[model samples]
Target chain A: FSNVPAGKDLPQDFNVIIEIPAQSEPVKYEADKALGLLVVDRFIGTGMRYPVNYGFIPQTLSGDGDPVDVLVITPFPLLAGSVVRARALGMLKMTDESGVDAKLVAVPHDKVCPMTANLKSIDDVPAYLKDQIKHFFEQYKALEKGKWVKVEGWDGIDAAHKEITDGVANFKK
Target chain B: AHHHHHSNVPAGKDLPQDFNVIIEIPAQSEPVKYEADKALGLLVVDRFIGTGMRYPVNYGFIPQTLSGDGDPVDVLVITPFPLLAGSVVRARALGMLKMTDESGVDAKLVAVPHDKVCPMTANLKSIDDVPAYLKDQIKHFFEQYKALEKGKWVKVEGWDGIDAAHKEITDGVANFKK
Candidate 1:
């Protein structure tokens, strides 16, 4: 009844794994350290409004050299939709440190790249595999516009524009 | 006191000076249903996506009294204190429907003062206006939330609390006084 990728069979649920690779020498303002947790919250809240309950794995902290990972389980209804739009907006206000540009990132639906799929439970996710997931989300959040896209929608598109405009205004203000 | 037919009271007016009267008005059991405009729906959807909160459950449509099209019925959300799910509270107009001729709808989130309807209506008007103080309150809220995200609980310098923040941002463009 619905169109999905050829190789991809829609799983009843999927888990989100945000992985941040170990930096060469501890990059300043690391994404996982700064926003790893909140990013998970945003994803859950935004996803649930659509009545989707993709489960989310709590963020975990590891040794300095280990990569960071945040995992989330995808709800079935979300899989029914053709595309999902996942977005992250981060803005650091001007304080003692010079303010940085607020970043907005959106990942498209086909690109709902999951670290692991077709899983029975969150526990099924391998520990090392989970670490990779967290690393990706953190790296994406840290980029000039480190946001990922799971699906695309009018709201997400509009938010992209608003995020940029608001970022500019905040800098000026 | 006895009164004769020739009393000072008008001859035609034969009513008692002091009498008790009782009148009752029926309560509303069913709500009016209205078709909302696409633009209005988009706005509601936008807010939901931005804040990750589902609001404006019942859409109201009213017949246009003066202009070209009818107006979208405003949805009110009542809360105790100020925040959405804090302390004691109740919700009305949750699933009530109203008819309208317009193509769009404007959803409103109203904070009730106590649990009373009268005070809720009064406060609703004040919240419509997006004053400077309210704007600052919103900015402060976002800042605080951002801080919380960073695992920091820095005291928000100004503004009352989250309740005020909800009023200021949500009612930014609405007309306060009718």
Candidate 2:
């Protein structure tokens, strides 16, 4: 999903749907990689919701043949499928057996959501939340019995935006 | 596979090793379930369908404890004995998996049965009594099982020894009703 400012000099914000919520869920991800929208999991447990606005950037493609992944660090719960805007802050460069499965990290573009009233930037997201997001991806496949995923850590918004733009180009290509 | 139900079960003071674990998915259970209403039978809380292996321990929860996930705090019963779903067993707290999932901070308490029933965990005193793979497998269990669909666990920290578990679970129980 390319940032939406198209031509003007204003900071572009990422466009995505709220795919999952925190403290509750059916675990939604991967299935809607191509269609690019909010799709709930048919089999995930009801134990917890997603911690962030975990979703995909539409019209973009990653090496894994899926829509580029995103985690919008807004401090409130947006309903599944609620389209929102976010300022790209950084990216977590990662890889599995497939290839560059980078995750775009962004914060809500403005203080529109009350939950995000105090969040000014990506740095405002607590360290524990960042660590948890990273830790979950690394070993999520442990049940499959092997560590196939590895993360290279965070890079600035410029890089994150580039990955999305590049992935959008890949989508067009 | 390890748990020992001792005859002298502590009543007044519960030790880390003396916790009551309400089994939701027994170690060898198929089609795992979480208890939504025990009086109404297992309410199919969640199913294990990802490519990961079945649970490595008798997984359940400690009553009166609410976790960040909003469920009763989770407990992993390490026992050599095969238990059934709905079976309540006594376990000794050994450690905790302080896990950060994409949703929030959900910590799981790791323990062995206080009474001895098998050779695998007959003389264990702490999580250190197990091998690195044992600990590693559980982390994978938490991550990979949901990874197939959700795609992130964030971070998982292993705080070994019952002393730490004692504090967390006890705090969990205390704050559960609040």
Candidate 3:
């Protein structure tokens, strides 16, 4: 009889897959004191026939271990002054021999879909939007000058890492 | 001139305590008409002080009919600016005062107070502390008069929204009384 490996004998390895949509560009800046402004801009394609999603992944990892890559996923062609919202997800891996690892990630969608309006060009942008962009650049300059401070989320990765370390210490104890 | 209460006086004394004497003064012959001039149009009249503070000289404006003998009364001629209306008209005392005396016979042109009448006349500033009723009257008069002028009707809008916006622009250009 020929020896055949059973399906139950197969081993499962830890893996992480990030799915971002097409057309949008995500940029990263020095969110805190640890990491400087690390930005990556590109587009991703959707799986369907129309191929709507657009996104990008960073070639370099930030010093703070945050993904600086951004993707813009939309149902329709985006023009200047189009407002977009972003969402993020995180994943973790653990093994008996190796320690635990976690990574925070996001995806963007930019394509011919719905809920998009080509209000006007950048030049035709409303005074309010112009003010907001101006404020953003001002803040960026202030950050470079060390006059501004960084902000953290309610449950940031650093705090999660500390919690995991404490859990491990308790398990050993 | 018979003195009735003089008992100690001599028998033939002619001292009358009460006597009637007639003084004849001629009446004004013709009616006078004062034309509104350009400089008079810029005059601004406003009450400097409140009614409680007594003004030594009372300024009055009597209608033409009130002058019984067609004699011009000692009237305060006011030439208010186009912006002010009605009784809001205020003017400084000009060097022209043409009036007839109580006799109303002779018309003489004399200067009483060309530059100085009341001590505060030189410093007579527009406080605009006018009564609400008077202000309303002046505003209504201004609206009527302005509507009669050319190029005024085109600015008004029939719709409320457009009218409000137009009014805002107009008010920004020049704060109208309304």
| TM-score (all chains, Cα) for each model | 0.21, 0.42, 0.15
Q: Model 1 segments beyond 4 Å from truth?
A: A4-82, A85-106, A109-173, B1-71, B80-178
Best by DockQ: 1
- Best-to-worst ranking by DockQ: 1, 2, 3
In model 3, which runs have C-alpha deviations exceeding 4 angstroms?
A1-42, A45-173, B1-159, B175-178
True contacts kept of each: 0.00, 0.00, 0.00
Regions more than 4 Å wrong, model 2: A1-173, B1-17, B31-48, B116-120, B150-154
Which candidate wins on lDDT?
2
Comparing 2 and 3 on lDDT, the stronger one? 2
Model 1, docking class? incorrect
Docking class of 2: incorrect
Rate residue A143 of model 1 by lDDT.
Answer: 33
State the DockQ of every prediction.
0.02, 0.01, 0.00
Error of 2 at B126 (Å): 1.0
Ranking 1 against 3 by TM-score, winner: 1
Looking at model 3, residue B75 earns an lDDT score of: 25
DockQ, structure candidate 2 = 0.01
Q: How close is candidate 2 to the true structure, as a TM-score?
A: 0.42
